[PDB]
């Protein structure tokens, strides 16, 4: 599409998210979600092919259903208290409908099914935007009304999301489905700490976004969407594979990497509330994510796979487009554990 | 006696369209250097009755494979809407005095396209369905500009009440305040009723014909009330009724004149006409008629 049109659509997506995050009226939050949905579809359908159209249709259906449920919860809450301000829910039925709608918007289990489908359908840039920027608004709304949420339902969905992400990522050879299931598991980790500390939710979101940005930019640079395609990257650009391996180590939560910071803190926070069993199950389940990250690391940099003859031609050329923020993203997603107490900045 | 009022409003409209058939045929005959029907009846006056009797006794060609449901429903909806549009009309006293009369008539007019859609879809023919789709697109296209012109003109009135239009025009006709909107409104009414130069498309056919001709008379009566305001004396409304009927007859005869005078458009030509000549002028004149009462300090009373 026209670059001016693309810029306008991206700025409309961002303006919808900002309208969600700056408003105090439920109607304006709903309008921000609507604007974001409206401007998101062409971005997903930018590279026109039937797969992207199918993904855009699935995304539109799920997000429109979530918006309808959100409006239903808003109207019930208005019925039981003539309030439009985002604060308390004022009704058990309105809070359940609201949590369901926001979980469907985020992709939390049991509403996770659309995430791998849409992420596989769309390109790598659309998947980057979808898995990073589209979580800011529902999570901000959840952070605002967290004192209303029933901890049982939120914790159930968080544990389900962690389990589903772990088990579903084990079976994947496509990189985009791996990213989708990783996103699902990280959403589960984020929403399990909302009832206790929203600061830890925001910290986990920041760390996850940094790691996901680095991972997607590395995947775009070495333009591979398949495990075997990524196995060829060492014969052209081994440093990219090494950075990818260290980033995958960070994504698995292995200390002393950056990805260890959220889970640790989250576990720490949950122990202050006499919650012991659930963090233990969460860590043991995140071991599965680490396992399939290790499988990818084996396939990418730790061993050298067979190549093809035509690769020699690729040795003679350099990337025309380079990413300005990729080195900063790699360093931030790898080496910020010593700076952990800075989380008091209420990020 | 509300039932008596309803019947004395409805039966005369049907008789009026019955004789509108004769009046149109004879007027175009005399405009074509000939005479219309002057054999059946003293001056052709029995021609509509003969046509009705002939049509009501002819075999009804049910398509034998179509959906009988929609086939029956479409004429029902057509007649019901055509007769309902006459309810809020103030001549001078309306049968059903409503606050949002204009809005109600707009909503009924919006419903009017379902009959076309259902008749096309239940005809069991690809070509008839294509024709129905073309007609529906033309109708919705021109109802956009009808709605905008209508709200622009009502900005001079103060409300959507149809009776207030009599008070708004007690000294001067609304034709002088805004003739360009009136011209575009007249052309849009021609294009809505699928009338020449925009006519690009036994029992049920008779009901469809009755609905269309009732719609023609209704549109002309609404135009007369909207733009050619008759003075109403509260102690003798017969003068207002006479003036209103005369203006409605003049406008209907003007439709007949136009049908006799011009060739017809192509589909793309009338689509282009609307979307690239009427819509921009309609929007500009809507801005002008929004700003004019504020510029001149002449905002109408009711709020």
């Amino acid at each position: 599409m026209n670059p001016i049109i693309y810029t306008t659509l991206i700025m409309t997506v961002m303006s919808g998210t900002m309208l969600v995050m700056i408003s105090s009226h439920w109607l304006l939050i709903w309008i921000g979600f609507e604007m974001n949905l409206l401007a998101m579809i062409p971005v997903l359908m930018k590279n026109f092919n039937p797969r992207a159209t199918e993904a855009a249709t699935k995304y539109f259906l799920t997000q429109a259903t979530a918006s309808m449920m959100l409006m239903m919860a808003i109207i019930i809450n208005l019925l039981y208290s003539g309030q439009w301000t985002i604060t308390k829910m004022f009704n058990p039925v309105a809070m359940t409908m609201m949590t369901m709608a926001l979980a469907m918007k985020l992709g939390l289990s049991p509403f996770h099914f659309w995430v791998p489908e849409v992420t596989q359908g769309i390109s790598l840039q659309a998947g980057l935007l979808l898995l990073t920027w589209q979580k800011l608004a529902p999570l901000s709304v959840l952070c605002q009304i967290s004192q209303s949420i029933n901890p049982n339902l939120m914790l159930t969905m968080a544990m389900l999301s962690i389990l589903i992400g772990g088990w579903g990522g084990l079976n994947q050879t496509q990189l985009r489905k791996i990213m989708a299931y990783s996103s699902i598991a990280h959403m589960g980790w984020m929403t399990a700490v909302l009832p206790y500390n929203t600061t830890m939710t925001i910290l986990n979101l920041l760390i996850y976004i940094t790691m996901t940005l680095a991972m997607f930019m590395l995947l775009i640079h070495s333009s591979a969407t398949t495990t075997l395609s990524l196995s060829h990257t060492w014969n052209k650009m081994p440093v990219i594979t090494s950075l990818m391996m260290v980033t995958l180590l960070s994504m698995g939560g292995l200390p002393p990497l950056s990805g260890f910071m959220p889970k640790w803190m989250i576990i720490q926070e949950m122990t202050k509330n006499e919650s012991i069993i659930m963090p233990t199950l969460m860590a043991m389940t995140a071991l599965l994510n680490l396992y399939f990250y290790m499988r990818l690391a084996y396939s990418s940099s730790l061993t050298m796979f067979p190549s093809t003859n035509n690769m020699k031609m690729k040795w003679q050329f350099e990337h025309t487009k380079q990413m300005k923020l990729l080195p900063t993203m790699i360093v931030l997603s790898t080496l910020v554990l010593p700076m952990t107490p800075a989380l008091s900045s209420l990020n | 006696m509300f039932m008596i009022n309803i019947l004395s409003l409805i039966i005369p409209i049907l008789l009026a369209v019955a004789f509108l058939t004769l009046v149109e045929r004879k007027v175009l005959g005399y405009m074509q250097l000939r005479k219309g029907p002057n054999v059946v009846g003293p001056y052709g006056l029995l021609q509509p009755i003969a046509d009705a009797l002939k049509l009501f006794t002819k075999e009804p060609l049910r398509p034998a494979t179509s959906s009988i449901s929609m086939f029956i429903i479409a004429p029902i909806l057509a007649l019901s809407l055509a007769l309902t549009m006459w309810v809020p009309l103030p001549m001078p006293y309306p049968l059903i005095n409503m606050n949002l009369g204009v809005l109600f008539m707009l909503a009924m007019s919006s419903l009017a396209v379902y009959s076309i859609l259902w008749s096309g879809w239940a005809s069991n023919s690809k070509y008839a369905l294509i024709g129905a789709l073309r007609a529906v697109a033309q109708t919705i296209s021109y109802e956009v500009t009808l709605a905008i012109i209508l709200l622009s003109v009502l900005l001079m009135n103060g409300s959507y009440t149809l009776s207030t239009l009599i008070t708004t025009q007690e000294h001067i006709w609304m034709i002088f305040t805004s003739w360009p909107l009136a011209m575009m409104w007249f052309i849009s009414t021609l294009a809505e009723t699928n009338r020449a130069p925009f006519d690009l498309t036994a029992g049920p056919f008779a009901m469809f014909f009755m609905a269309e001709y009732a719609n023609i008379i209704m549109m002309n009566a609404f135009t007369a009330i909207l733009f050619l305001g008759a003075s109403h004396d509260p102690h003798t409304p017969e003068l207002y009724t006479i003036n209103f009927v005369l203006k409605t007859l003049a406008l209907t005869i003007t439709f007949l004149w136009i049908r006799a005078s011009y060739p017809r458009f192509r589909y793309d030509q009338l689509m282009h006409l609307l979307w690239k000549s009427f819509l921009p002028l309609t929007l500009a004149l809507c801005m002008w008629h929004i700003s004019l009462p504020i510029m001149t300090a002449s905002i109408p009373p009711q709020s």
Partner: protein, 113 residues
């Protein structure tokens, strides 16, 4: 060409001036009608209060007659903590009256055309 546009603009201006005058007169007439309504309003308010209180009193007396034998019932017990006056609903006034005037008080304005 020029003459046609001149005639159109001139007739537009004449219509604009006439409508300016007439609509200013209509504004003044509306203000006068509003003045009359304002002058009449206090009597209507007094009658409204008297009628509402009288209907409430009739309801209270009939409730006292009816619920004489209900054990835990208190006659005329408020449902609100506050002692401040609360405007009664439609069903508080016409609850015990006949169906036709219930329909009247509920839908007479809506159904009047």
């Amino acid at each position: 060409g020029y003459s046609m546009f001149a005639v159109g603009i001139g007739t537009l201006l004449f219509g604009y001036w006439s409508m300016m005058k007439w609509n200013r007169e209509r504004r003044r007439l509306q203000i006068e009608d509003f003045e009359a309504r304002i002058a009449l309003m206090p009597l209507f308010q007094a009658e409204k209060d008297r009628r509402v209180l009288q209907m409430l009193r009739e309801n209270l007396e009939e409730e006292a007659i009816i619920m004489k034998d209900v054990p835990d019932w208190k006659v005329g017990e408020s449902v609100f903590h506050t002692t401040r006056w609360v405007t009664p609903m439609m069903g508080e006034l016409y609850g015990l009256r006949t169906n036709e005037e219930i329909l009247s008080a509920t839908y007479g304005f809506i159904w009047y055309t």
